[PDB]
Amino acid sequence: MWPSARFVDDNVAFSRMPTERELDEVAKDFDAVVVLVEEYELPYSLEEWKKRGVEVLHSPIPDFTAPSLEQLLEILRWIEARVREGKKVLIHCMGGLGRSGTVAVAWLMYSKGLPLREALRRVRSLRPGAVETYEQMEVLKELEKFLR
């Protein structure tokens, strides 16, 4: 297993950016990748995944910012679609874990129904530093109100 990945359930993990020499290593374990950074901050083309047969959701979120609620729900629905087909999904931004940690917390909330306080504690137990900003916290609170 690519040891930088941390799983929040059997099928969904989050990590830092894989480097180019790690792409086969990721493709072996993950059939889908959610890429939360703009192309300009990547050191390879996302075509690298296509030639490996790995499905890609490219949904950029600017550095240190939160996704909109609609963007977050689109990402969650896509992750659910892949998990329903039995694939494993890797979520990543850069090296920080604000954006990727936000999606990981949201996934526990969306897929398991965990309350925000428990989903947050769980993901921060995996990587202290998941969910960096007040705005990232606020979109998670909006997600909770949407789910109920």
Residue numbers in the entry: 1 to 148
Quoted passage from the original study:
Remarkably, the oxidation states of the catalytic nucleophile, C93 differ depending on the structure, often with multiple oxidation states observed in a single structure. Specifically, we observe the cysteine as: (1) a sulfenic acid, (2) a sulfonic acid, and (3) a rare cyclic five-membered sulfenamide ring. The relationship between the P-loop conformation and the oxidation state of C93 is unclear, in part because multiple oxidation states are often observed in a single structure.
We present here an engineered chimeric PTP (ShufPTP) generated by shuffling the amino acid sequence of five extant hyperthermophilic archaeal PTPs.
